């Protein structure tokens, strides 16, 4: 083992899927089997469950340069944005999407997802 | 909303987007990673070798591409410019799954054998 390899002190993950990291070094995990997104601040030993509600099998997470957090809420066929500070949840205006899976956000805030229903990449 | 003109994906999993808007996909059902530059009518199969159910992809600011080669229990990196694949020196990781890379180049993965997050500086 290298000293450069460490296990981060998340707690009780169940089939974790995608993860993301922000410029503060906080790590975000789509904890699919617990229907939640957890965040571990750099150096913390206590993870934080983020204030999304009503998730069903979240599979991917991304964080933009303003600190908004995006999750693919796969089995609700939607992508949810958690606005920084306010913690408002916004369902992004994708049309006719089923089982969004992976997610990434670019520097401009454009959201990209993979979809299993039809094997496509969709940009919003 | 637009569908990007990738061709022939089968069970795409993770994706990534670089500082120039190129999109990279872990095309898990085809054991390959596909890249599409912004606005292009051409996709590129990147020269990763020997992938087996790759699940996640990430790309750093200098264009290196990182992939969780899940069923080979390894994380691989395609060096920008040389296009040589290297295996990152993780030890005893099984079923690495999601991936992200921070601004320092540190690699973070989820893994499905024991449900952990592993960091490699």
Question: Which among A2, A47, A65, A104 is the top mutation candidate for probing chain B, defined by the most B β-carbons within 10 Å of its own β-carbon?
Answer: A104
- Rounded Cα distance between B94 and A69, Å, is 28
- Choose among B3, B17, B120: nearest Cβ to A122: B3
CB contact (8 A) between residue B91 and residue A1:
yes
Q: How far is A84 from chain B (nearest CA, A)?
A: 20
Determine how β-strand B43-45 pairs with β-strand B56-59: unpaired
The beta strands (E) that lie in chain B are given as: 2-3, 12-17, 23-27, 32-36, 43-45, 56-59, 65-69, 74-78, 85-87, 96-101, 107-111, 116-120
- Rounded Cα distance between A21 and B103, Å, is 9
CB contact (8 A) between residue B102 and residue A25:
yes
Per the entry, the structure determination technique was X-ray
Sign of CA dihedral A64, A35, B29, A114: negative
With contact defined as beta carbons under 8 Å apart, do A55 and A35 qualify? yes
CB contact (8 A) between residue B12 and residue A102:
yes
Q: How far is B115 from chain A (nearest CA, A)?
A: 6
Closest CA to A9 of A52, A51, A38: A38
The domains located in chain A, with CATH, are 16-123 (2.120.10.30)
DSSP letter assigned to residue A54: S
- Rounded Cα distance between A106 and A49, Å, is 24
């Amino acid at each position: 083992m290298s000293n450069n390899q460490t296990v981060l002190p998340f707690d009780g993950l169940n089939y974790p899927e995608g993860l993301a990291v922000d410029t503060q070094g906080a790590v975000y995990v789509a904890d699919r089997g617990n229907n939640r997104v957890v965040k571990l601040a750099a150096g913390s030993k206590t993870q934080t469950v983020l204030p999304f509600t009503g998730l069903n099998d979240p599979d991917g997470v991304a964080v933009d340069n303003s600190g908004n957090v995006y999750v693919t809420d796969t089995d609700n066929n939607r992508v949810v944005k958690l606005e920084a500070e306010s913690n408002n949840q916004v369902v992004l205006p994708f049309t006719d999407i089923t089982a969004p899976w992976g997610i990434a956000v670019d520097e401009a805030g454009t959201v990209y997802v993979t979809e299993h229903n039809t094997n496509q990449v969709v940009k919003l």
